[PDB]
Amino acid sequence: SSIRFSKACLKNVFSVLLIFIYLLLMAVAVFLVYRTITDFREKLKHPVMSVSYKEVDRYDAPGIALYPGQAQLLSCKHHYEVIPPLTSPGQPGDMNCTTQRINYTDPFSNQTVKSALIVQGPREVKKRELVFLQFRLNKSSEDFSAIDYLLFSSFQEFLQSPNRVGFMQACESAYSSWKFSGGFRTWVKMSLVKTKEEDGREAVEFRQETSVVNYIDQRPAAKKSAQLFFVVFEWKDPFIQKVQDIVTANPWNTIALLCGAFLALFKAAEFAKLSIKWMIKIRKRYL
Amino acid sequence: SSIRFSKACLKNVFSVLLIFIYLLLMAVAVFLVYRTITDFREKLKHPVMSVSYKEVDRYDAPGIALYPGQAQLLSCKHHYEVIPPLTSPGQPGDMNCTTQRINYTDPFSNQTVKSALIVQGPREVKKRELVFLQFRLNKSSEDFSAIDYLLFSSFQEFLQSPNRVGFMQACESAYSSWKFSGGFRTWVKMSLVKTKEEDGREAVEFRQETSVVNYIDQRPAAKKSAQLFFVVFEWKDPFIQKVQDIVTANPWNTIALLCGAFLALFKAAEFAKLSIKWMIKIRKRYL
């Protein structure tokens, strides 16, 4: 009796189930062909990459592979406010810092062993956290008051990574080395750029806009006169700049093109069936 | 008589009206769902943003919140050509400049009141306009020949904005502060990056590539020997770098995905009706 009437609603619910099953079939189809696109993009070298910024509230505290060598750290003290207060130059102490000394061999050197110091840099951008590393060095024949410094992604990873020697060589091969001057401060407003490799590894690079400021020799005011170094590391922007393959990093566009492509193939097949019918009518007109 | 023949053209014009009304319906549909997408993207925090350059012929003259404090401006003179001509160091005058002195409290300080000077920076990029601000400072205990400087979007806005104290605190919270050295020029080839917030406010940041050049003490050649400061502000590139939410800044792509989505739902519903007919034929084959 009422089954004949409820057959309409049953057919309607079966119809919506058909809608959604064909949606899921089309979705898995575009998913598979897009996975094929991605796994082919992987196989090729040097793909045109996009750019993408991701505003971050607090960074991951990075490493600062200072290369003092013969020099020594004189003071390390984070400073929330944007102003590092008055100091006492040439006087050690106040090394309120979390450092590690690591030795390794530079791959490009492969014959020179250099000693590296590490520092947990600033991680609170909005708070304007900045680490002030003050150094000192008695006169040497280096002809240049210079010590280098690297910058890798996160210090927590360097703590929680085995084989720190190899990871240090890896972060040395990275394009984020720099040499801050000796004899005056070098405010280093670093910023991060995370590139995703074709293999998938998240290689990181930094992009620092230094601002050197002279060091008044009236402050030391001593007959010691040893080249003493200063840095202020802080984050320029809260926009971590990640880049990846143009298609992979913005999939919702290549999948849009793939839906366009499949729908166009479908539609053009429907139009071709219509054209077959039209040609059949034209042939029947000949008789 | 002829009405029966003109009925064909009437039906054709009504048909094209149907084409365009269904186009406008589909357009308002994708517009509404895309507005929903945007107003949801607003609700979330830290969305992956795109990047976009917009070549500009003439910039808006920006503010340069110089923080001399105890120091004083010695000369300000724009220079169209790429070369600032020979000067007379240590001699005031020629302050051919449009400055304003503003006092406020730094939010991170909140207990230190600092005095700020403002300068209408260069706005003609192609002409290579560059403002040369020359300073001077008698010896202090600051231990560092340093005065800071900010950079906000436009000086015309700072003129036409009420409550300059609050706007100055806001532009101070921005990530565009810098400290140019004292004792030698600091060519500051600044460039602008306008980020659009999730709320919609157009936050601006600068990205300066300084190039410090030493100041030959043979030029002053006086027993005064006061740390005197120099800057040359100019625009690096004419490409103002604006960034916004990946979807919002490039809508023509997410709307393309939405047209793909609606057309795919339509088509898959048509295919599901075809499958219903096929299943009905299969059931009729059973009898």
Add this chain to the structure above:
Amino acid sequence: SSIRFSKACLKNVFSVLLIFIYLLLMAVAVFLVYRTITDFREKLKHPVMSVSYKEVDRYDAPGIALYPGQAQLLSCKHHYEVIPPLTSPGQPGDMNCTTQRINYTDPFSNQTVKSALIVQGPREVKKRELVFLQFRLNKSSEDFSAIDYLLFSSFQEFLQSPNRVGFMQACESAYSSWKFSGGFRTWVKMSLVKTKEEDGREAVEFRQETSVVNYIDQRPAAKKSAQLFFVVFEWKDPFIQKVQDIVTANPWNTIALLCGAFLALFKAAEFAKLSIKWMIKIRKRYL
């Protein structure tokens, strides 16, 4: 006999030929309308451009338009390793370099003739190639130990370009000039940004993150005391940053939108035919 049976396969092959011919027709259609979009985008001024990185294994060795003028080059020697070894300051020789001296008139000057030196900069990024140009200059009245330097795309082009004067003026109009200090090294980790103009010309710009490091006067240790200059040019990143019109540089997205548009017009026309049939049924219900 068997022709009646093979007619099915013949119709099927003709059908697939219809599929592909209508695909090619639709493809040429979207190609033509997209070419129209591009040739209109050309006609307009200042289009919002995208950004795109392209990892490069070896750069094209660029020119370094050093402007010493009265000064002189003291040593030029590429160095694969990341370390320039110990030197002998103030002593000429070892100019293991490929330079050219070119004279021209600065367009903004148009009355001052300046002499330019060119250097084949580093081109091997992964090898960390870096050119160290050491200079010297006896005391002058320039009041500033400064000599400028430009950076254009490739030195091979400057060798293989006629009218080097005009090309030098063109690369001078480019936004890639800089002034490295005198009296201490200036490590210049340059990087390249190739912008594609609306006309189509591939304008190049550089983006250098210098890192000045002081020059210990204990190394010269002579009563000569002439301001002598130092630079170390190397590539910051292997990601050449090319930018072009938002649509032109990423066509596969605007063509996706165009396929969406054409398919939507088609579908909405089909739906309008269905609505015509529905209105005809509604009118027949009136009788």
